[PDB]
Amino acid sequence: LKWNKGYSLPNLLEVTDQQKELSQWTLGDKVKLEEGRFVLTPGKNTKGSLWLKPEYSIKDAMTIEWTFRSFGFRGSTKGGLAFWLKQGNEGDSTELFGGSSKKFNGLMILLRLDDKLGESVTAYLNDGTKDLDIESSPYFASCLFQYQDSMVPSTLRLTYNPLDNHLLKLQMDNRVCFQTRKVKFMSPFRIGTSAINDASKESFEILKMKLYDGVI
Numbered sequence: 553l554k555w556n557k558g559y560s561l562p563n564l565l566e567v568t569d570q571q572k573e574l575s576q577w578t579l580g581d582k583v584k585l586e587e588g589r590f591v592l593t594p595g596k597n598t599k600g601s602l603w604l605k606p607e608y609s610i611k612d613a614m615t616i617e618w619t620f621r622s623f624g625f626r627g628s629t630k631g632g633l634a635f636w637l638k639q640g641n642e643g644d645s646t647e648l649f650g651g652s653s654k655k656f657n658g659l660m661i662l663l664r665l666d667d668k669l670g671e672s673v674t675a676y677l678n679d680g681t682k683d684l685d686i687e688s689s690p691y692f693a694s695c696l697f698q699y700q701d702s703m704v705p706s707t708l709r710l711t712y713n714p715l716d717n718h719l720l721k722l723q724m725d726n727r728v729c730f731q732t733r734k735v736k737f738m739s740p741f742r743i744g745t746s747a748i749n750d751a752s753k754e755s756f757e758i759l760k761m762k763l764y765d766g767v768i
Contacts, residue, residue: 629750632665638742671698
């Protein structure tokens, strides 16, 4: 019924000791906690990431909820915000939305201005044996979704139940974006988010993150 504190962000507003309360998280590149939320991309042409340090081992089912926003810029850009669920064998690199090597094993859910859909969520699967090329390489699922330049946060909710033959549901603001059974590897995996902006200074921000050891 309750969230796994070990694989969640603490209440960020209530954070008094950054070191202790975030000890399970790796802050990558330019990410900074400012006035109750993480700003992934606080400056012009910056990147930033939040990754859970411990790998997660699903028991029966799992729910991840990220609360995020993009503030300060509406217009054309190559920048975007990614949410990750990826198997091990690291070797760092941030070429893919401040978060990964073009070559990876797992799921990348991207909020960006897609050249053809516009503002959207697009979901990508890679198996570790290829270079994901955002233009060529296909997404397996998507929805149109307005995120640019809003103070009002959005919630991405990923539910996954291996016991229901790997049903994965992605909701945005409690509205279904997609459901699928094509994502199956979830063995332990790493959970995180990353973003990159450009000179227009889009501010990609994380306000909350909870993992639950079940479907809600």
